[PDB]
Write an enzyme that holds these catalytic residues in place. Structure first.
Site, PDB file in Angstrom:
ATOM      1  N   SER A  14       0.613  -0.919   0.123  1.00  0.00           N
ATOM      2  CA  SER A  14      -0.422   0.135  -0.130  1.00  0.00           C
ATOM      3  C   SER A  14       1.394   1.511  -0.407  1.00  0.00           C
ATOM      4  CB  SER A  14      -0.618   0.157   1.436  1.00  0.00           C
ATOM      5  OG  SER A  14      -2.033  -1.090   0.903  1.00  0.00           O
ATOM      6  N   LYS A  53      -0.523   3.476  -3.218  1.00  0.00           N
ATOM      7  CA  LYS A  53      -1.598   4.214  -2.818  1.00  0.00           C
ATOM      8  C   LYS A  53      -0.444   5.157  -2.802  1.00  0.00           C
ATOM      9  CE  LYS A  53      -4.491   0.816  -0.494  1.00  0.00           C
ATOM     10  NZ  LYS A  53      -4.129  -0.199  -1.160  1.00  0.00           N
ATOM     11  N   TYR A  71     -10.307   1.696   5.121  1.00  0.00           N
ATOM     12  CA  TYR A  71      -9.934   1.510   4.818  1.00  0.00           C
ATOM     13  C   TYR A  71     -10.046   1.118   3.677  1.00  0.00           C
ATOM     14  CZ  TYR A  71      -4.408   0.966   3.128  1.00  0.00           C
ATOM     15  OH  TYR A  71      -3.651   0.635   2.416  1.00  0.00           O
ATOM     16  N   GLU A 103      -0.383   9.559   4.929  1.00  0.00           N
ATOM     17  CA  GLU A 103      -1.331   9.950   6.409  1.00  0.00           C
ATOM     18  C   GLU A 103       0.000  10.561   7.603  1.00  0.00           C
ATOM     19  OE1 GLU A 103      -2.336   6.307   7.617  1.00  0.00           O
ATOM     20  OE2 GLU A 103      -3.146   5.559   5.093  1.00  0.00           O
ATOM     21  N   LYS A 109       3.029   6.431   5.745  1.00  0.00           N
ATOM     22  CA  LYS A 109       2.676   4.907   5.119  1.00  0.00           C
ATOM     23  C   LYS A 109       2.759   3.646   4.890  1.00  0.00           C
ATOM     24  CE  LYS A 109      -1.369   3.584   3.371  1.00  0.00           C
ATOM     25  NZ  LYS A 109      -1.153   2.616   3.921  1.00  0.00           N
ATOM     26  N   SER A 159       1.903  -3.739   3.107  1.00  0.00           N
ATOM     27  CA  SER A 159       2.304  -4.873   2.905  1.00  0.00           C
ATOM     28  C   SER A 159       1.871  -5.574   2.091  1.00  0.00           C
ATOM     29  CB  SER A 159       1.834  -5.207   4.705  1.00  0.00           C
ATOM     30  OG  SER A 159       2.075  -4.209   5.319  1.00  0.00           O
TER      31      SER A 159
END
Ligand SMILES: *[B@@]1([O])O[C]([C]C([O])=O)C2=C1[C]=C(OC1=[C]N=[C][C]=N1)C([C])=C2[C]
Length: 360
Positions: free
Chosen positions: A62, A65, A149, A271, A314, A317
């Site tokens: 991720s 992202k 999420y 984030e 961030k 996995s």
């Protein structure tokens, strides 16, 4: 000497966590005062004894992202889409579905109304199956209210951003995004000639695990990269002004916060947290409940610049790998930690926090 002290700090943070989590191989890259530093540990493959280096390719899950968010930032700069567009504007198959009432921002920030963590096992990597999944989907709650999420959520955001640019997502990443960022060791589909660099991933009883195909995998979790290339991407995030203007603006679009959940401010991909903050609070923001449960959001009156005394991060996995990236804009500090085991996020943050605290 300074090199001995830096190696001592990174080794003291990394080595006990690798032993405790049985991590076969781990790469660290740090950007400090405009200079890169690499620390490589263990094995990329236990079976053939290939050692981790700063060029070893790891799955970053991720963390992908944040790359997806960068491509969407580019579509925004080009005026091909707007965050307040209805999702169905960009895909006629979705016209008349519930995506007529969901914004691209809601998809990007997981607030579309309960799109699940993963696509159901019944949805394979097939355009018609993905299309039909979205056409039939109905929200569990009002869009813009709760964060859950979700790979189908930001995955659709990336897919629609690619449609707005008139090209497939994977093609735009290979042909435009990675070259604009100076990334030559970053892949969605690892070339055969680069396979010798691809680490093995390890699961239960050291089962070998490399990520398999899935719906919107590229957008959600499909990047493979080295610690050196991922640090180049962190450095581009620390200094977007060094890139050509459209790409600087694409990166800037990922440094804007839209709402808060506890201590975390949600941007596109990234984030953010206030810095300093305790290790326990940073672990809680990167905890299993944040990935698995819905949370009501506290919307900001205007998008907030994610700069200064903040830590942007961030986790990522896959079944066989565990990545973590963090940077502090106001301190010109960046860190990458890539491993070939999916080890607990709390442990990744523990290594990062020991490094960042010791650099300070
Ligand atoms: B992603 O990597 O972010 C979380 C895990 C983390 O580190 O926070 C996540 C991501 C993707 C994902 O789906 C997936 C992962 N690997 C292969 C196929 N699908 C999940 C389930 C989670 C939790």
């Amino acid at each position: 000497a300074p090199a001995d002290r830096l190696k001592a700090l990174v080794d003291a943070a990394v080595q006990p966590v690798m032993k405790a989590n049985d991590i076969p191989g781990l790469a660290v890259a740090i950007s400090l005062k405009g200079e890169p530093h690499y620390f490589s540990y263990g094995l990329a493959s236990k079976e053939d004894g290939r050692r981790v280096t700063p060029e070893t390719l790891f799955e970053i899950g991720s963390v992908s992202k944040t790359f997806t968010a960068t491509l969407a930032g580019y579509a925004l700069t080009q005026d091909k889409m707007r965050l307040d567009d209805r999702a169905s504007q960009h895909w006629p198959a979705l016209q008349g579905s519930r995506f007529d009432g969901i914004s691209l921002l809601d998809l990007a920030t997981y607030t579309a109304g309960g799109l699940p963590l993963q696509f159901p096992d019944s949805v394979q990597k097939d355009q018609a199956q993905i299309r039909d999944y979205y056409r039939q989907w109905q929200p569990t709650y009002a869009p813009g209210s709760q964060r859950l999420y979700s790979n189908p959520s930001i995955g659709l955001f990336g897919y629609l951003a690619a449609r707005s640019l008139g090209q497939p997502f994977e093609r735009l990443m290979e042909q435009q995004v990675f070259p604009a960022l100076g990334l030559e060791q970053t892949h969605l589909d690892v070339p055969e000639a680069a396979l010798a660099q691809y680490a093995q991933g390890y699961g239960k009883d050291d089962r070998p695990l490399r990520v398999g195909p899935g719906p919107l995998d590229a957008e959600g979790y499909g990047v493979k990269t080295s610690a050196a290339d991922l640090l180049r991407f962190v450095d581009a995030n620390l200094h977007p002004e060094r890139l050509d203007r459209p790409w600087a603006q694409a990166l800037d679009a990922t440094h804007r916060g839209y709402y808060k959940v506890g201590d975390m401010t949600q941007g596109l991909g990234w984030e953010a947290y206030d810095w300093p903050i305790s290790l326990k609070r940073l672990q809680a923001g990167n905890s299993t409940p944040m990935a698995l449960q819905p949370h009501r959001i506290a919307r900001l009156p205007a998008p907030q610049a994610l700069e200064g005394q903040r830590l942007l991060n961030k986790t990522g996995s896959t079944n066989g790998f565990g990545a973590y990236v963090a940077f502090v804009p106001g301190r010109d500090l960046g860190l990458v930690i890539l491993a070939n085991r999916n080890y607990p996020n709390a442990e990744r943050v523990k290594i990062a926090y020991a490094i960042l605290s010791g650099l300070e």
